[PDB]
Amino acid sequence: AIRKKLVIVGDGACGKTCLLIVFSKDQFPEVYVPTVFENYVADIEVDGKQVELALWDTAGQEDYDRLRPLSYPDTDVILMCFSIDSPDSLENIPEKWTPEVKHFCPNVPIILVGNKKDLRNDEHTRRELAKMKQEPVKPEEGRDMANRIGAFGYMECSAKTKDGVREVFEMATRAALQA
Amino acid sequence: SMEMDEKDFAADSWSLAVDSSFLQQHKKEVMKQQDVIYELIQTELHHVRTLKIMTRLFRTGMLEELHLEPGVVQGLFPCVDELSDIHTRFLSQLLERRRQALCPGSTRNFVIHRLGDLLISQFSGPSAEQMCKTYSEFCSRHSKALKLYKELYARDKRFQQFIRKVTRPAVLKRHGVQECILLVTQRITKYPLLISRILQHSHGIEEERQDLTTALGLVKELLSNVDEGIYQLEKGARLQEIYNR
Numbered sequence: 001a002i003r004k005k006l007v008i009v010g011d012g013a014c015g016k017t018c019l020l021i022v023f024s025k026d027q028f029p030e031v032y033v034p035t036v037f038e039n040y041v042a043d044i045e046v047d048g049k050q051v052e053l054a055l056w057d058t059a060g061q062e063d064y065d066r067l068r069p070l071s072y073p074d075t076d077v078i079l080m081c082f083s084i085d086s087p088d089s090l091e092n093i094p095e096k097w098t099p100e101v102k103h104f105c106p107n108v109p110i111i112l113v114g115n116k117k118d119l120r121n122d123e124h125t126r127r128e129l130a131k132m133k134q135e136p137v138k139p140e141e142g143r144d145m146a147n148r149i150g151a152f153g154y155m156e157c158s159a160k161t162k163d164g165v166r167e168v169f170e171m172a173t174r175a176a177l178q179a
Numbered sequence: 180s181m182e183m184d185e186k187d188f189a190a191d192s193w194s195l196a197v198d199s200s201f202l203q204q205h206k207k208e209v210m211k212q213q214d215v216i217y218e219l220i221q222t223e224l225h226h227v228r229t230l231k232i233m234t235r236l237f238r239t240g241m242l243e244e245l246h247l248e249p250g251v252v253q254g255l256f257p258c259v260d261e262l263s264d265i266h267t268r269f270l271s272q273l274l275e276r277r278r279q280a281l282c283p284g285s286t287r288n289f290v291i292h293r294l295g296d297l298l299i300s301q302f303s304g305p306s307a308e309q310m311c312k313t314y315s316e317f318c319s320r321h322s323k324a325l326k327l328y329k330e331l332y333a334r335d336k337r338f339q340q341f342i343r344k345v346t347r348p349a350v351l352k353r354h355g356v357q358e359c360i361l362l363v364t365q366r367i368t369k370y371p372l373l374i375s376r377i378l379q380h381s382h383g384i385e386e387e388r389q390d391l392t393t394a395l396g397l398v399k400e401l402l403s404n405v406d407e408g409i410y411q412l413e414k415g416a417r418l419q420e421i422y423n424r
């Protein structure tokens with residue numbers, strides 16, 4: 001079991017904290033959803049290879065440009081997150097997060113992840129976004145952004161229902177193992 | 180970490196820690212407020228534990244078993260005694276507020292109504308000055324500590340065996356040397372999130388809402404000051420390179 005390090009980046013409202021919590025417990029909390037995530041070492045077996053994947057969140061570091069890059073040393077894979085219920089979080093991917101991750105993590109694979117996919121067909125979400133002349137991010141808009149930033153791949157998931165969550169972390173593990 | 184505090188904070192939430200007959204006596208909003216306060220104290224207990232692993236398990240083991248030079252050990256664990264002093268004091272104040280709130284005849288049923296004042300005291304005056312001085316120094320020595328660790332692990336056999344020996348137990352799975360350093364660096368940026376969520380459920384008493392609003396502002400001032408006082412030290416980086424950060 002080789003040790004690999006994963007860091008999740010993205011806007012404060014992208015759902016990165018919830019994604020880490022749901023994956024590490026294999027459960028969306030029934031009683032209390034934690035505010036913060038400390039760290040976790042997941043035992044994952046992907047394509048016959050056993051890996052200890054250390055997980056790290058960047059939540060709370062978004063306004064601190066000298067504190068935030070201390071999370072990046074020796075990172076093996078980046079999860080770059082946006083929320084499907086927030087086209088504004090997707091717009092911040094190519095010129096804020098991407099050049100930062102390419103600077104502090106050169107040659108590290110980036111997986112672009114569309115979180116909260118359950119809200120794409122949520123009537124309350126669609127009514128709320130239409131007031132600011134917006135709509136939930138479409139899967140092709142996510143793929144085009146991933147292609148544009150040179151992402152390793154594009155994936156979607158829902159921490160609420162768990163759909164696609166295991167797949168995201170198994171793919172991150174495969175990316176961390178590549179040359 | 181002592182058994183008494185571990186057991187008091189074993190449950191995933193305050194609502195699962197207290198007796199269900201005591202939980203049923205409170206409004207929904209008080210339950211939500213207490214669950215977030217419990218998360219703050221439980222994560223503070225874990226952070227103090229991380230600092231004890233660094234001082235007692237790693238630092239002291241390297242000094243007494245490997246007989247490493249105090250200067251090498253200092254480079255690996257900068258400011259660890261100061262950090263441990265700050266957070267053990269803050270943890271003591273948090274646990275004392277919980278202890279005073281316990282119902283007679285109970286060691287688990289409590290409600291903390293006045294957290295704001297404790298947070299204002301921790302993030303103002305001399306304690307805030309010491310937190311700012313200590314974290315500005317620690318975070319500026321972060322890169323140097325990781326590089327020094329990697330060099331020692333790769334070139335020193337006895338150091339590699341020491342690390343593998345003391346990090347083998349399952350209870351140390353998340354707490355290797357580099358992991359402890361990043362856990363400590365990330366701790367300060369967790370406070371605003373926790374405080375803001377406690378504030379969200381503390382509108383019932385206007386004075387409490389005001390105290391948490393002041394505390395949140397003080398934590399943000401501290402983080403901005405620390406962030407502005409950071410410059411990564413690099414062993415070998417001649418003064419000609421300091422000018423372009």
Ligand SMILES: NCc1nc2ccccc2[nH]1
Pocket residue numbers: 030031032033194210211212214215
């Ligand atoms: N069911 C317990 C519970 N629900 C919450 C919602 C928000 C904050 C804390 C909470 N605790």
